[PDB]
Amino acid sequence: MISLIAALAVDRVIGMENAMPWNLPADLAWFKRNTLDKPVIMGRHTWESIGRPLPGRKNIILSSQPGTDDRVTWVKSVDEAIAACGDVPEIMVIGGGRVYEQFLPKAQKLYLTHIDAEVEGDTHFPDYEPDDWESVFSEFHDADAQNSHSYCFEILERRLE
Amino acid sequence: MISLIAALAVDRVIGMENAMPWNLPADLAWFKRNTLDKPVIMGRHTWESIGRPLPGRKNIILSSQPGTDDRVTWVKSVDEAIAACGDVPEIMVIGGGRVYEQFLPKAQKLYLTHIDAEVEGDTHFPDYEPDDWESVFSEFHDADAQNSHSYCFEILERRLE
Ligand SMILES: CCc1nc(N)nc(N)c1C#C[C@H](C)c1cc2c(c(-c3ccc(CN)cc3)c1)OCO2
Ligand SMILES: CCc1nc(N)nc(N)c1C#C[C@H](C)c1cc2c(c(-c3ccc(CN)cc3)c1)OCO2
């Protein structure tokens, strides 16, 4: 199945990891832990930010533009992106805002990092209906030496019921 | 012992409950639950906001001004406020910003509600040193019908070690 994983500031603002507070080391280790050995789907700007593939897994870029790097797989539609992952237990959609919006209908699981911080931003995570999603896990953490703000991991699963 | 209980928006902004998002019904029930049958200490503006005593417990107002309501106890110093609670297991300090600051050194426990919302505000909860406080409990909640933002209860205890 298809999962979205995203780090969210207040009012569900999202942004690229190079900047602060998305540079919470704890979130980076959470992200690595939940995408390890799974295929990842991302949009072109996310691919541009990261600059090179995430290791040891299929990296798929969803884009209307022809590909410019042969280390990853380029596709033009959502169904092409899904089919390119093959038969696997879980597909991870890792951003950005437009890709989250396209994949949210088919997604069955969300891995959210709620970061207790203010950031100015244009792009928000999709507005998932609280009614169709069941929170099944949450884990709060205080700000500490390495992490500049408090943050809460959460996992939700679609109430297909 | 002395405990501070407070609802905090991002960057530790605090405000009176009449306004939103401090009007999270879930926080109100959390507040009632943790102050029931305990003496409460508050500053004059908090007393002014609430307009009448919290029922079934000693209400102490810390203020440099002479009292104007005989249903509560008025005192002028922190030690007077503590002594007026008598011999009890737990004293609850319920605001506002100046009272939290005065009582934080003697406090041994914090009940914090982290509300995932933006509010403009002048007054912040005191900047407790993460080093002297151990988080011993946290419980995250999604926004729902009755609660307009997500929120996380947390309890910390002083590392007097
Ligand atoms: C972790 C963030 C993060 N947290 C959560 N919860 N969900 C997410 N979907 C992402 C993300 C992201 C995108 C793909 C992104 C964007 C980037 C990145 C990186 C990056 C990732 C791993 C490593 C390993 N060293 C280095 C960089 C990643 O680097 C510059 O822009
Ligand atoms: C609950 C907020 C709240 N949450 C948390 N975590 N910590 C807190 N220290 C307070 C608070 C507060 C102050 C005392 C306050 C200020 C107010 C209040 C009320 C009020 C309280 C109970 C009831 C019962 N119906 C009604 C009103 C309370 O009403 C107008 O201004």
Q: Which residues of A touch B116 (CB under 8 A)?
A: 10, 114, 116
Contact B118 A117 (CB under 8 A): no
> Across the strands, what pairs with B79?
none
CB B105 within 8 Å of CB B1:
no
Alpha carbon distance B27, B17 (integer Å): 10
Residue B140, both tokens: 């995250």
Contact A130 B143 (CB under 8 A): yes
Q: For residue A62, give the H/E element and its range.
A: strand A59-62
Instruction: Out of A3, A8, A17, give the residue to mutate to test ligand 1, the one with the largest number of ligand atoms within 8 Å of its CB.
Output: A17
Alpha carbon distance B62, B42 (integer Å): 6
DSSP classification of residue B147? -
Q: Which residues of B touch A154 (CB under 8 A)?
A: 140, 142
Alpha carbon distance A36, B27 (integer Å): 38
Which residues, at least 6 apart from A54, have a Cβ–Cβ distance to it below 8 Å? A35, A40
Q: Is B144 annotated as a binding residue?
A: no
Is the CB–ligand 2 distance for residue B50 below 6 Å? yes
> A99 by DSSP, 3-state: which?
helix
Q: Specify the residue for token string 């199945």.
A: A1
| Host domain of residue B92 | 1-161
> A61 by DSSP, 3-state: which?
strand
Give the best residue of B110, B113, B134, B140 to mutate against chain A (max A CB count within 10 A): B140
Experimental method for this entry? X-ray
Is the CB–ligand 2 distance for residue B96 below 6 Å? no
Alpha carbon distance B115, B106 (integer Å): 25
Q: Can you give the resolution of this entry in Å?
A: 1.9
CB A46 within 8 Å of CB A94:
yes
Work out the end-to-end distance of chain B between its first and last CA atoms, rounded to an integer number of angstroms: 17
Domains contained in chain B, number: 1
Q: Which atom, in ligand 1's list, is nearest to the CA of A7? A: 6
Is the CB–ligand 2 distance for residue B75 below 6 Å? no
Omega of the bond prior to A21 within 30 degrees of 0, cis? yes
